[PDB]
Every structure is written in C-alpha cells, then in structure tokens.
Amino acid sequence: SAGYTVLRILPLVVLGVTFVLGVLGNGLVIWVAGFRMTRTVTTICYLNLALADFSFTATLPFLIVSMAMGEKWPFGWFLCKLIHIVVDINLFGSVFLIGFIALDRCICVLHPVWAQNHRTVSLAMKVIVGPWILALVLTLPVFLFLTTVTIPNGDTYCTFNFASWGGTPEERLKVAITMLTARGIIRFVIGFLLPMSIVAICYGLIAAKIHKKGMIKSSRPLRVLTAVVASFFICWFPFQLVALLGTVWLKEMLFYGKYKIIDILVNPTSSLAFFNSCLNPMLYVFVGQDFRERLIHSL
Amino acid sequence: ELDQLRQEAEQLKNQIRDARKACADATLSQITNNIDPVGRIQMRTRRTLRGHLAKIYAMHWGTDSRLLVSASQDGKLIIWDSYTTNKVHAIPLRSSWVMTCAYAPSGNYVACGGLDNICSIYNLKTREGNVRVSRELAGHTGYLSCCRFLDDNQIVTSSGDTTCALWDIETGQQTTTFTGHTGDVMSLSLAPDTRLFVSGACDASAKLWDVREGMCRQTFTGHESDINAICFFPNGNAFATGSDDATCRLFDLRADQELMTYSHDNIICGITSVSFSKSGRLLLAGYDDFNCNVWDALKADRAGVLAGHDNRVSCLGVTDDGMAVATGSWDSFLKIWN
Amino acid sequence: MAPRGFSCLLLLTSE
Amino acid sequence: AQARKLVEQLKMEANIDRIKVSKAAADLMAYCEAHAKEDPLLTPVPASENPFR
Amino acid sequence: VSAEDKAAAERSKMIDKNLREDGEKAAREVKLLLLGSGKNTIVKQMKIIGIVETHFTFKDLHFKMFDVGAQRSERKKWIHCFEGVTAIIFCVALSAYDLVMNRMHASMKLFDSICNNKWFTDTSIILFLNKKDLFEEKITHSPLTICFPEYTGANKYDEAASYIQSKFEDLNKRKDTKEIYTHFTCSTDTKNVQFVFDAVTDVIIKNNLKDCGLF
Numbered sequence: 001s002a003g004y005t006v007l008r009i010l011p012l013v014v015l016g017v018t019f020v021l022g023v024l025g026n027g028l029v030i031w032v033a034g035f036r037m038t039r040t041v042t043t044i045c046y047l048n049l050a051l052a053d054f055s056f057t058a059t060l061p062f063l064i065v066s067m068a069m070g071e072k073w074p075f076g077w078f079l080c081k082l083i084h085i086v087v088d089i090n091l092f093g094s095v096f097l098i099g100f101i102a103l104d105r106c107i108c109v110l111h112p113v114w115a116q117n118h119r120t121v122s123l124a125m126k127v128i129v130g131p132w133i134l135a136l137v138l139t140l141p142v143f144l145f146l147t148t149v150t151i152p153n154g155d156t157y158c159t160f161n162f163a164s165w166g167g168t169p170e171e172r173l174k175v176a177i178t179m180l181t182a183r184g185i186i187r188f189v190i191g192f193l194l195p196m197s198i199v200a201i202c203y204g205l206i207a208a209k210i211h212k213k214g215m216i217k218s219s220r221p222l223r224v225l226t227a228v229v230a231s232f233f234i235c236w237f238p239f240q241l242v243a244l245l246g247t248v249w250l251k252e253m254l255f256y257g258k259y260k261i262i263d264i265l266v267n268p269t270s271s272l273a274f275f276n277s278c279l280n281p282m283l284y285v286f287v288g289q290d291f292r293e294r295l296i297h298s299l
Numbered sequence: 300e301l302d303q304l305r306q307e308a309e310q311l312k313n314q315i316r317d318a319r320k321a322c323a324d325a326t327l328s329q330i331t332n333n334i335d336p337v338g339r340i341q342m343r344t345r346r347t348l349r350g351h352l353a354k355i356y357a358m359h360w361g362t363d364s365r366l367l368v369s370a371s372q373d374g375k376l377i378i379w380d381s382y383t384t385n386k387v388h389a390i391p392l393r394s395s396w397v398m399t400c401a402y403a404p405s406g407n408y409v410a411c412g413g414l415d416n417i418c419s420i421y422n423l424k425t426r427e428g429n430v431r432v433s434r435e436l437a438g439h440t441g442y443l444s445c446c447r448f449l450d451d452n453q454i455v456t457s458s459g460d461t462t463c464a465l466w467d468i469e470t471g472q473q474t475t476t477f478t479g480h481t482g483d484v485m486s487l488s489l490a491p492d493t494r495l496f497v498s499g500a501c502d503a504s505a506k507l508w509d510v511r512e513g514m515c516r517q518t519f520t521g522h523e524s525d526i527n528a529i530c531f532f533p534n535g536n537a538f539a540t541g542s543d544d545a546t547c548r549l550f551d552l553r554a555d556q557e558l559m560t561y562s563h564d565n566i567i568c569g570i571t572s573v574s575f576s577k578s579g580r581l582l583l584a585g586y587d588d589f590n591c592n593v594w595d596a597l598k599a600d601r602a603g604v605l606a607g608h609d610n611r612v613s614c615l616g617v618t619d620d621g622m623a624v625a626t627g628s629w630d631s632f633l634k635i636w637n
Numbered sequence: 638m639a640p641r642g643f644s645c646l647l648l649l650t651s652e
Numbered sequence: 653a654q655a656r657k658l659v660e661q662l663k664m665e666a667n668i669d670r671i672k673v674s675k676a677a678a679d680l681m682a683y684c685e686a687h688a689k690e691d692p693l694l695t696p697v698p699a700s701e702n703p704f705r
Numbered sequence: 706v707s708a709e710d711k712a713a714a715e716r717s718k719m720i721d722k723n724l725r726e727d728g729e730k731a732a733r734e735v736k737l738l739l740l741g742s743g744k745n746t747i748v749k750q751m752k753i754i755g756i757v758e759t760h761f762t763f764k765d766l767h768f769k770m771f772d773v774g775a776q777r778s779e780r781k782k783w784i785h786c787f788e789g790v791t792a793i794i795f796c797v798a799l800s801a802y803d804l805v806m807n808r809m810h811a812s813m814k815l816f817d818s819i820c821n822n823k824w825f826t827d828t829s830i831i832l833f834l835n836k837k838d839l840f841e842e843k844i845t846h847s848p849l850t851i852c853f854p855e856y857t858g859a860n861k862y863d864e865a866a867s868y869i870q871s872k873f874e875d876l877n878k879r880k881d882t883k884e885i886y887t888h889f890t891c892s893t894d895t896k897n898v899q900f901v902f903d904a905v906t907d908v909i910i911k912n913n914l915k916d917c918g919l920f
Contacts, residue, residue, distance in 0.1 A: 036609075042916050071642040084639055091638040105917055112909040113766045117733045122725070142639070149651050159644045163652035172650040180644075191638045206919075213907060217881055221919035243640055253645050266640050287918035305655050308662055315666050322670045327677040334681075337694065345704035350721060352728040354788075372786060373728060377720075382703050383710065385717035389724055395731075396756055396771075396786055414776070414783060415755035441778045459778035479661055483778045501779055515661055516668070534683040536676070554676040555665075578687035580694055597681055622692045623704050637692065637704055 007264060014271040015064045022057030022278030026050045029281045032294050041124040045104065046285045048128055049097045053277050056090035059083055060274065067267065073158045077148040080158035084146055088139045092191060094277055096131035098232065099195035101284065106202035109209050138190065141183060177251055184247025192240035196233070203229055228283045235276030239269035319555060327549070327558040331597045337580060340593060340603040345623065346384050348633035350377050353395075355627040356413075357445075357614045359402040364618035367625055368409050369633060370400035376411055378423070381625070381635065388430050390421050401446045401454065408433070408468070410454060412443025418456045420468055436466050438473050445486045449493045449510065457484040463498050463508060475513030480506055485527045490535040497538050499526035505540050505550060519550045521557040528573040528584070528615075532596075539582055539596070541570030547584050547594065561594040563601060571613045577621025585612040591626055607634045734760070734767040735905050738787045740819060741796035742812065743835025743890060744774055751898045763902050770794065780818070788824040792831045792886075792908050794901070795819070799840035799869065799889075802852035809852045813876060820877040829911070831904045832873055832887040833897070834866065884911075 029050040033043050062083045066073055073080050108115040145165075148158035160179070166172025203225050210216055246253070246262040253259055285291055353373035360367050366387060367379045374395030378387035396414035403409065403423075412418045418436035425431060441459025448454045453474070455465040463477035463484055482501025489496045495516070498506050503525055507517035519540075528541030537551040537558065547561035547570055561582060568587030575582060581602065582594040591612055593603035605612075610630035617624045626634045688694055692702070699705055739747070739757075748770065753761035757772035771790075776783070795816060802809040816832075819825055834840075841862035849856045849865055853872070858864045870887045877885055886904035890897060914920040 040916070067642070088639045095638070105913075108913040108917070109910055112906050112913070113764060115913065116735070116909060117765060117767070120729045120732075122729075149648055151648070151651075157643055157646075157648055159641055159648060161651065162649060166650070169650055176649045180641075187638050210910070213910070215907065215910065221914065224919055239640070250645070254647070254649075257645075263642075263645070266642065270640055285918075289915070289918075291918075301655055304659060308655070308659050311659070311662055311666065315662075318666060318670060323673050325674040325677070327673075327680075330674060330677055331681060334685075340693070340696075342693075350724055352724070352731075354786075356786075373731060375724060375727065377724075380713060380717070383713060385713045386720040386724075387713075387716075389720045391727070394756070394758065396783075398783070398786065414773070414786065417755060442776065442783050444782070459776070459782065479658075483782055485782070501782065516665070518662075518665060532680070532683075533687070534680070536683075537680055551673075551676045551680060553671045553679075554673045555670055556673045556676070558673070558677060558680070576691050576693040578684050578691040578694060580684045580688060580691060583693075597684060617693070620692070621690070622697075622702070624693065635704060637696065637702060 004264070007268065011267040011271040012064060012068060014268075014275060015060055015067075018271070018275045018278045019057050019060040019064070021282075022053055022060070025278065025281040025286075026054035026057065028295060029285045029291075030054065032291060032298060033285075036294050036298050037291070039121060041104070041119055041121060044121065044124055044128065045097065045101050046281075046291075049094060049101070049284060050281055052090045052093040052097060053280055055086055056094065056274075056277055059086045059090070063087070071157065073148070073156045077158065080148055081143075081146060084142055084158075085139060088142045089135045091273075091277065092135035092138050093132055094280060095191055095195050095236075096134060097128075098280065098284075099198040100128070100131055102195075102199045102202040106205050109206045134190070138186060141179060145179060173254075177254075180250050181247060184243060184250070188240055188244045188247075192236060196236070199229060199232060224283070224287050231276060231279065231283060235272045239266075239273040242266055242269045315555075322554055323556055327597065328599060334597070336598055336600055337595055337602050340581070342593070342603055342605060342624070342636035344607045344634045345637055346381075346635050348377075348379050348384060348635070349631070350379075350386050350389075351375065351631040351633075353631060354610070354629035355614065355631060355633065356397065357399045358616050358625060358627045358633065359400055359447075360616040360618050360625065361402055361406060362404050362619050363406065364620050364622050366402075366406065367616070367633075368400050368402045369627060370397045370411055370413075371631065372396065376400060376409065376421070378409070379633065381623075388423065390430055392419070393432075399443055399445045399457070401448050403448045403451055405451050407451055408448065410446045410448065410456075412446050412456060414442050416441065416443060416458070418443055418446055418454070418466065420454070434468055434471050436471065438466075439464065441483060444484060447487060447489045447496070449489065453510075455487060455489070455496060455510070457487050457498065459483040461500065463487065465510060465513070475510075477506075477508040477513055477515070479515040479518075480504070482525060485525065486529045486541075488530045488538060490531050491533070492535060495535075497529050497531065499529040499540055501525040503542070505529060505538070507552065517552060517555060519555065519557075521548050521550070522546070524569070527569065527571050530573045530575055533575055533577065533579045539573050539575070539584075541573040541584055543569030543587075545569060547573060547582065549582070549596065559597075559599055561599055563592075566592070571611075572615035572627075574615050574617040574624065576617060576624075583615055583617060583624055585615045585626070587611055589628075591615060605634070605636055607636075608632065734769045735792075735909075736787070736790040737768060737770045737831070737901075737905075738790050738793045739770060739772040739774070739796065740793060740815060741774075742798040742801060743833070744772060744796045746835060746890065747794065747796055747833060747897065748772060751901070763898050766902060766905070768901070768905075784819075784822065785824050788828075790825075790828060791905055791912070792829045793819060793825060794831045794833065796833050796835050797873065798836055799834045799866065800836050800843045802849060802869075803843060803847040807852055813873065816873055817876050820879055825883075826879055827883055827915075829883045829904070829908045830877075830885045831901060832870075832885055833890055834870060834887070835890045837862075837866065837889045837891070840866065884908075 033047045145160050147161045149161050162172045162176045249259050351371040353371045355371045357370040369377050374392045376390035394415035397411045398413040401410040409421045416439045420434045422433040439458040445457035452468045461480045464473045465475045467474045480500040484500040487498045503522040505519040506515050522542045524542045524544035526540050526542050531538045539549045545566045549558040570584050572585035582596040585591045591605035595602050608628040610628045612628040614627035623635050623637045759770050797812045844860050844865045848860045888900045
C-alpha cells in the first residue's frame with residue numbers, strides 16, 4: 001500500500017487542473033461563439049458542448065472537496081442532489097453532443113447536398129433538444145433514487161438508497177441490484193457504446209471520403225481526427241470498462257466483496273473522463289481557424 | 300487641330316491652377332489655430348440593429364431622425380425604427396446585388412440600386428397593402444453606386460458608366476444626364492436646398508453638377524486615388540471627399556480650393572463613407588481598417604474613434620438634427636452612436 | 638454516467 | 653467633338669469668380685461656432701433629451 | 706404608448722421571422738461567379754430554370770450562376786460584392802490563342818487578376834476550356850509558338866490542351882489554400898453540369914471542414 005498514496009493524491013490534482021482548464025476554455029468558447037460569432041449550426045453545437053462542459057466543471061470543486069476525505073458530503077440533501085443531477089446530465093449531454101457532432105460531420109461530408117439544403121439553424125436547435133431530453137430521461141433515476149443518508153458515526157454519505165422503495169430488506173436488496181444493473185447497462189450502451197460506435201463509424205467515413213477524393217493537402221486534418229478519436233477512446237473506454245466490470249460483479253461485491261481493485265481504480269478513470277470532458281473544447285472548438293481569429297481579435 | 304485644341308485645355312487648366320495659386324494665401328489650419336479644440340468625444344453604441352444576414356453596403360437616414368433604410372447583399376431592404384430598434388418593413392429585392400439606397404425627404408419612397416443597373420423605387424405607404432415595387436429606373440449601363448432623392452418625384456443616381464443622371468419618377472425617364480467625368484462615379488451628395496449637388500468618381504476628381512442645367516459648374520482634382528465617398532457641409536458651401544489614398548480632403552465651392560486634408564501617419568487604408576454633424580464640426584469618416592474615425596473638420600485632429608464593428612465599414616450617415624450617427628458595416632450589423 | 642463510489646458499503650439499504 | 657465639348661465645359665469654370673480662401677475659411681469656421689450649441693454630437697446630451705437612452 | 710409599441714414589436718418579430726426564413730432559403734443555393742469566350746455556351750446548356758442571374762437545380766442542389774459580362778466598369782469596385790461565393794466559373798476559349806495584345810494573354814491576365822485577388826483567396830475557380838472542337842482543328846494549322854513562345858511540344862491537341870491547362874493552373878500563386886477544377890467543354894449532355902456539381906461538391910467539403918476545423 002506504499003504506492004496507494006499516489007493513487008489517492010493524483011486524482012485530486014487531475015480534477016483540479018481539469019476544473020481550471022475546463023472553466024477557462026468553456027468560458028472563452030461561450031463568450032466568443034455566443035456573442036462574437038455568427039449564429040451557425042456548428043456554432044450552436046460547439047456552444048452546447050461548451051455549456052455542458054462548463055456546467056460540469058463548475059460543479060467539479062464540489063466533487064474535489066467530496067473525494068478529498070473519501071466521498072464524504074459536508075453539504076446537504078438539496079445541494080447533493082443538485083450536484084449529482086448536474087454531473088450526470090452534463091456528462092450525458094456532452095457525450096451525446098460529441099456523438100451528434102460526429103453525425104453532423106459525417107452527414108456534411110458524405111451528403112453535401114443534404115447538408116446544404118436541409119441543415120438550418122432552427123432544425124439544428126430542434127435536434128440538439130433531443131440529446132438533452134435523453135440526458136434528462138437517463139438522469140431520472142438520479143432524480144428519484146439518489147438521496148442523503150447518514151451513517152451512525154455522524155459522517156454524511158449521500159448516494160443511492162432504497163429505504164422507501166423496498167419496504168422490506170430482501171425487496172430493498174432486489175430492487176437495488178436491479179437498478180444498479182440497469183444503470184450500468186444503460187451507461188455502457190447509450191453513454192459509451194452508442195457514441196463510440198458513432199464516433200468510430202462517422203470519423204472513419206470522413207477519413208475514407210477525403211482519402212478517396214485525394215483532398216488531403218496536409219496532415220493537419222488526419223492528425224486532428226486521430227487525436228480526437230484516440231483521446232475520446234483512451235479517456236472514456238477505461239472508465240466505462242471499469243464501471244461495466246463493477247456492475248457485472250456487483251452482486252458478488254455486495255454479497256462477498258471478491259473484487260476490490262475496481263473501488264480504487266474508479267477514481268483515476270473518472271479523473272480521465274473528466275479531463276476528456278474539459279479538453280473537449282480544445283480538440284473540438286480550438287481547432288478552427290475562424291474561432292482562434294475571433295478569440296485573438298476580441299482580446 | 301484635335302491635338303492643338305487639346306493642348307489649349309492644358310494651358311487653360313494651368314490658368315485655373317494659377318488662379319487657385321493666387322487665391323490660396325492662407326490655409327484653413329493657419330487661421331483655425333487660435334480657437335479651442337473640441338478635444339475627445341466618447342461615442343458609445345446605444346443600440347445594435349441585427350436583422351441582416353449579409354454585408355451591408357449602404358444606409359440613409361430619415362429627415363425625422365427616426366427611420367433609416369439599410370441595404371444589404373442578402374436581397375433585403377429593411378426600414379429600421381431607430382428609436383425602438385424595430386423593423387418597420389422588409390422589402391424583398393429582385394436583384395440581391397444592391398450597393399446603394401435612398402430615403403425620400405417626405406418619407407414616402409425608398410430607392411435602391413447596384414449591379415442590376417436599375418433604380419427601384421418603393422412606396423412606403425401602400426395603403427392598399429404590403430410594400431411593393433412602384434417604378435424601376437433602367438437607363439444606366441453601369442452599376443448604380445449612389446442615389447439620393449431630390450423630392451417625392453425627382454431623384455439623381457450615380458452609376459458606373461461614368462455619367463450621372465437625374466430621374467423623374469412619374470415619367471420614369473432621365474430628365475437630364477450629367478456628363479464630363481472620366482472614371483466610374485461612386486458617390487453623390489445633395490445640398491440642403493436641393494439645387495446643386497456634388498459627385499465623386501474613380502478619376503480622383505470631384506465634380507459639381509447643377510440640377511436644372513445638367514452641366515458641370517465646378518471640378519475639384521486634389522486626390523491621388525479614386526473617390527468613394529462625398530458629403531456636403533451643413534451650410535452647403537463646402538464638402539468633404541473620402542478616397543482610397545487614406546486622405547480625406549475638404550473642398551469649398553466658393554474658392555475652388557483644397558481647404559485641408561484629414562490624414563494621419565498610422566492610417567493607410569481607404570475611406571468608404573463620410574458624413575458631417577449638425578454643425579459640421581465633426582467629420583465622421585469611415586475607414587477600411589474595420590472601424591470609423593471622427594475627424595475635427597477645422598483642426599484635422601482625430602477627436603474620436605468608432606470601433607464597435609466586426610467587419611469593414613462601408614456606409615455612414617448622420618441624422619438631420621445631428622442627434623445620433625449610425626454606422627453600417629459588412630458584419631451585417633448597424634451601430635448607432637451618440 | 639456518474640460512478641457510485643461508496644454505494645457498496647450497504648448504505649443502499651440503510652434507512 | 654469630345655475635345656471641343658470639354659473645352660466648352662472647362663472654360664466656364666475659370667469664368668466664375670473665386671473669393672479669397674481665407675474669407676471662405678473664416679466664413680466656414682463661423683458656421684461651426686454658430687451652430688455648435690444645437691449639435692448633440694459635439695456636446696453629449698442627457699438621457700432625458702436623448703431618445704437613444 | 707404600449708398599445709402602439711406592442712403592435713410595432715409584433716410586426717418586427719414577424720418580419721424577423723420572415724428574414725430568418727428568407728435567409729435560410731437563400732442559404733442553400735450555390736453562388737457562382739462567371740468571368741472571361743464561351744461564357745454564353747456554358748449558360749445556355751444548363752439553363753434549366755445589368756448582371757445576368759440564372760437559377761438551376763441539379764441533383765437536388767440549387768445553383769445561382771451570375772454573369773458580369775455586361776459590366777464595362779472597374780472590376781475592383783464591385784468584385785468585392787461576390788466575396789463568399791462557393792466557386793468561380795472561369796471560361797477560357799481554347800481557340801483564342803491565335804486570335805488577337807493577344808486574346809489568350811488577356812484571359813491569363815484576367816485569370817491572374819482573380820487568383821491573387823484578396824476577395825477570393827479561399828474561393829475555388831472552376832476553369833472551363835471552351836470550344837475545344839475548334840482548337841483541335843486550329844492547333845495543327847496554328848502552332849502555340851505564336852501565343853506561347855516557351856513551348857517545345859508537338860502541335861497536337863492531346864498535349865497542347867494539357868500544356869494550356871497547366872499554364873493556367875501554374876499561374877495561381879495561392880497554392881495549398883484553394884483548388885482549381887479544370888475541364889474541357891463538350892457537346893455531350895450532362896457532363897459540363899456534372900463537373901460543376903462534382904467541383905462544387907468538393908468545395909462544399911472544404912467549406913464544411915474549414916468551419917468544422919479539420920482544414
């Protein structure tokens with residue numbers, strides 16, 4: 001356990017730098033796109049992604065001060081539910097917006113005529129509305145099931161609970177296992193499998209389309225595409241795989257506690273996912289020449 | 300014969316310069332140094348008009364200082380309620396390549412023109428219903444660069460065919476044609492009495508045209524590059540020209556003299572729009588460096604800078620009472636400054 | 638997508 | 653006939669009399685000082701008298 | 706008071722709604738500028754539906770071809786009005802090298818005047834070499850040495866046309882930022898229009914990716 005001190009300290013500094021970078025980048029992107037740039041479809045997609053990331057990172061200090069002493073919550077019931085609702089909604093919205101941006105790029109590259117004749121600002125806003133509705137639907141179990149409970153030692157741990165729902169401890173355990181399994185499967189499929197498949201399939205088609213047409217005049221587009229894909233993969237696949245492994249073995253973990261590496265491995269993976277969320281504007285918005293020109297002109 | 304007659308014109312031109320040289324004894328700045336400068340004016344954007352989706356090329360202020368017309372390349376001609384930032388009308392254009400627009404002094408008609416070489420007159424009242432085309436003046440072989448209403452029936456339009464023409468709305472025909480320029484005419488301005496107007500062309504010269512006679516009374520050649528903007532002084536005895544040589548020059552009709560020049564060492568871009576305040580003390584001139592500069596019309600001192608635009612500013616107008624100045628630009632935005 | 642940290646400590650059924 | 657027309661137009665420009673440039677400059681300057689008080693751009697006006705708040 | 710102010714606000718909101726709809730409707734058409742010599746032939750063969758403005762729809766894509774041939778004024782005064790067009794359709798007469806200041810050199814001067822233009826730095830040019838049928842019967846009788854002294858190949862249409870095409874492409878100093886799509890006009894149906902659609906489609910990819918940030 002000599003090296004566990006690093007495994008405990010590093011997530012804190014990673015979350016802190018993630019908070020700083022995410023707040024700075026998202027504030028800059030929102031200020032430039034929403035006020036200093038033309039209201040376009042790519043502009044509103046980037047603005048929605050930046051708003052989701054900003055609302056996620058503004059919450060990050062709460063998570064930092066929570067996991068500083070081991071996930072304890074010195075705050076209260078309302079603020080705890082607000083924090084976790086904001087985290088889950090913003091994470092789902094960010095991943096869904098990444099998937100939607102990949103789909104929009106694939107549509108623009110593979111079907112230029114459809115993009116020219118059927119990509120309008122109003123329709124774009126209407127179809128951005130959908131991912132937010134999906135995030136709300138998937139955060140509904142965070143809405144009702146999560147609550148604040150206090151251990152007899154006086155420490156406050158606000159997490160999911162089934163005291164009211166089950167009525168009897170066997171029923172409580174059954175419904176708790178059911179909800180955890182359903183939440184894990186939903187996260188792995190909709191939150192990870194759906195966007196990762198979309199990102200891999202889409203961005204591969206843009207790379208294939210430009211390669212077939214011989215439009216590659218420089219290595220910049222290929223480098224940007226592969227950097228985005230690799231960052232998203234190496235930052236989300238570890239966390240989602242750890243969550244899936246925990247959920248499939250969750251019955252054993254509660255009944256016998258056979259697996260314990262997952263408990264200490266979630267934190268670095270969650271830190272990596274958060275750092276991906278904060279770098280999303282850097283690889284998604286900062287890569288545009290017009291955006292950087294507007295940023296340097298506005299300063 | 301032809302060569303000898305042309306040579307006599309050069310000698311006559313030298314006589315005009317010699318007459319101007321004898322006339323020129325003291326510069327405007329020489330006698331203006333004994334008055335207090337205006338100083339600095341902190342003009343701020345009171346409101347922004349956001350209804351255009353393309354580059355704005357021209358605008359005109361109403362006589363009531365309440366309604367203004369804006370011309371933009373998206374084929375829309377919007378009448379702006381300046382006080383409440385509302386859109387009174389949105390006139391659709393058959394040709395989206397509009398580069399000029401005019402507002403009638405009575406407020407009943409609005410003109411437009413551009414690459415279509417047609418000056419379309421629009422009736423603002425339209426008691427029958429929505430706004431519609433009233434008349435189309437198609438008699439120019441060059442692009443329409445400027446147009447200004449003399450009254451509800453007479454209008455003079457600039458054109459790229461080097462010739463200016465005065466129109467008649469009821470008849471739809473050219474009442475008179477102003478010939479004598481060399482380059483393409485870019486802008487014209489009308490005196491307050493609407494009895495005499497100036498014109499600036501691409502031949503680096505400013506020409507004074509009499510409305511009734513239709514002939515050139517006066518010619519001003521003092522610019523190194525072509526002239527894109529021109530505007531009378533409020534008193535009507537002087538005017539200022541905006542060129543692409545980064546110099547604004549003030550000319551007075553009484554003496555045919557280059558009174559003074561409005562240029563600064565750090566300005567190299569051209570001028571696309573000029574205007575005067577109520578008293579004419581402030582010469583507001585647009586520039587190609589994405590922002591406007593306010594110039595002192597008597598001391599050549601830059602008394603203010605209008606830097607609230609995202610693209611290059613192409614048009615500029617001052618209200619009749621001088622209450623506010625509205626700036627147009629290619630960023631599809633209209634900024635109003637006090 | 639928010640990972641539960643200490644929901645395995647049987648606080649899930651605590652009243 | 654274009655050259656002859658130009659001379660017929662260039663000649664009359666010299667015929668009209670030109671007043672002294674100093675007199676024109678002084679008269680032009682007098683207009684600015686006479687109308688300076690009714691110039692909102694020259695002197696900012698309060699929001700009560702300014703329709704543009 | 707508020708009785709008339711509200712009515713004006715509703716009219717402005719209704720007008721603003723129309724402006725957004727009209728702007729969106731006007732945003733799906735491809736704006737092309739014609740310069741050049743076979744320009745009339747290009748317009749006539751694809752006229753499906755001042756300044757000559759024609760609108761045609763091919764493969765569900767709407768085009769707005771603008772001809773500025775009837776403008777005997779300074780180009781630089783109004784050439785900035787077309788800043789933002791998807792592509793420029795430049796027409797060059799292949800058989801104009803012998804015709805006379807050489808006519809072919811005038812086309813090259815006009816071509817260079819827009820390649821180095823500040824308003825079309827990122828705007829592609831869809832070059833067309835018109836009347837190629839007359840050129841093949843003219844290259845044998847009239848050598849290219851009259852028009853291009855620095856020529857060493859044989860007077861054959863197979864390589865003379867390529868040399869002429871390469872001459873215009875090499876004249877563009879704005880390399881690596883825009884692509885010049887060169888084609889030879891043919892009397893066969895749905896091939897000059899297809900090249901316009903194909904070239905514009907590639908340009909739409911460039912515009913989308915530049916906005917996206919890959920390019």
